[PDB]
Design a protein around this ligand. Structure first.
Ligand SMILES: CN(C)Cc1ccc(-c2cnc(NCc3cccc4c3CCO4)n3cnnc23)cc1
Ligand SMILES: [Cl-]
Ligand SMILES: [Cl-]
Lengths: 357, 29
């Protein structure tokens, strides 16, 4: 059974009063440095520092020049040469902005997606490799050191509708993506082709790889849109509108993830994490760094947490986190690197701080 | 088990990332 417990220590509301769709703690900050997180919503990116006694200290605010931009996602990285932190943000305009989080100014931008960007993810080993997933049915891999588009994952056997989410595995060898077409697709980036394309992007009109075929595809996990996917080791966690996060794997029970053939037609369900009132799309789940906790907010302000070290997903459920004043949809949550703080962000521009007891 | 084997892969792989992070000194925002 789960033993994790949390106390709500603070909340605030951003004055724009627009929904907050993303929240990310900076996991690159070194041990001892202040815990910082970014929120995104409206045409804004806001940074906060966590201090003792629940204090949430406003650091800086970035307001996009375009008043009609609606940011949907953000992700942290660092400059591999100077160790300086960096933040990537994107949304409805389909433009990626690289922001200097110390000065809160935009450094540069990437255009190319034909529609909105639903998620940004940085590679876990190479801080220059940025993955964007879009309403244009494709994923794109960028090298932000050389400003090149490494690869476009889409086409003949790519997604047939808007891509909602994607995740690199722990070592950054492969990506699982999911979207409106109900499918979950695997894209290996440790192939000889992709490793060479990444190397060529460092040597650099650069020619992008056009990856038309995924290494695995399934529409047999969910019966509707798949709006969130994360790797859990070699297994996958994904959700649709069934009020459940499904833990599954490509192939049969004993099939090795690295021996799965691209035409593999089987999938194996290992378990389900059940919850309530979260059957509308655009609701993300998150995990802590060590992947010992899983968190998901619902449409009425409840925050569910599960202990991933408890095998049975029913016994894994922690006490649901609720506050009588937190009644709006929790779009995304983020744990600090050490798992001591869990922040939730809402449709009513509110931010909620929960400290682990 | 499938669970214990998967947890061990997560433990080993997150430990590799944690050691890479420990070796870094990213400037505070
Ligand atoms: C409240 N009101 C303004 C209605 C409303 C308007 C726009 C969205 C809306 C929210 N997020 C993304 N993408 C980002 C995304 C993708 C997958 C899961 C996920 C997110 C954000 C949180 O979980 N969106 C892309 N297109 N629309 C949207 C949602 C609701
Ligand atoms: Cl991030
Ligand atoms: Cl191809």
């Amino acid at each position: 059974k789960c033993k994790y417990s949390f106390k709500c220590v603070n909340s605030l509301k951003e004055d724009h009063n627009q929904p907050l769709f993303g929240v990310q703690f900076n996991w690159h900050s070194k041990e001892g440095d202040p815990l910082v997180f970014a929120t995104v919503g409206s045409n804004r990116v806001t940074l906060y520092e966590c201090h003792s006694q629940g204090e949430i200290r406003l650091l800086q605010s970035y307001v996009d020049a375009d008043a009609d931009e609606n940011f949907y996602t953000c992700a942290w990285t660092y400059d591999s040469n100077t160790s300086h932190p960096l933040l990537a943000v994107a949304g409805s305009r389909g433009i990626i902005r690289i922001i200097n989080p110390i000065t809160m100014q935009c450094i540069k931008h990437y255009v190319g997606h034909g529609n909105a960007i639903n998620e940004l993810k940085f590679h876990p080993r190479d801080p220059n490799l940025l993955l964007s997933v879009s309403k244009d049915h494709a994923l794109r891999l960028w090298n932000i050191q050389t400003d090149t588009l490494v690869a476009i994952f889409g086409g003949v056997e790519g997604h047939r509708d808007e891509v909602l989410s994607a995740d690199y595995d722990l070592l950054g060898e492969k990506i699982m993506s999911c979207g409106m077409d109900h499918s979950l697709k695997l894209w290996r980036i440790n192939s000889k082709r992709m490793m060479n394309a990444i190397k060529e992007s460092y040597d650099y009109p650069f020619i992008s790889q056009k990856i038309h075929f995924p290494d695995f595809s399934t529409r047999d996990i969910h019966r509707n849109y798949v709006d969130c996917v994360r790797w859990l080791g070699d297994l996958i966690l994904s959700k649709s509108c069934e009020n459940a996060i499904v833990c599954w794997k490509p192939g049969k029970m004993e099939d090795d993830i690295d021996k799965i053939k691209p035409s593999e037609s089987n999938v194996t369900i290992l378990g389900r994490f059940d919850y309530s009132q979260c059957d509308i799309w655009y609701m993300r789940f998150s995990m802590d760094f060590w992947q010992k906790m899983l968190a998901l907010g619902n449409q009425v302000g409840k925050l569910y947490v599960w202990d991933l070290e408890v095998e049975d997903p029913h016994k894994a459920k922690c006490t649901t986190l609720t506050h009588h004043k937190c009644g709006a949809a929790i779009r995304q949550t983020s744990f600090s690197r050490d798992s001591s703080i869990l922040i939730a962000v809402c449709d009513d521009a509110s931010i909620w701080r929960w400290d682990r007891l | 088990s499938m669970f214990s084997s998967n947890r061990q892969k997560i433990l080993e792989r997150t430990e590799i990332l944690n050691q890479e992070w420990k070796q870094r000194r990213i400037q505070p925002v």
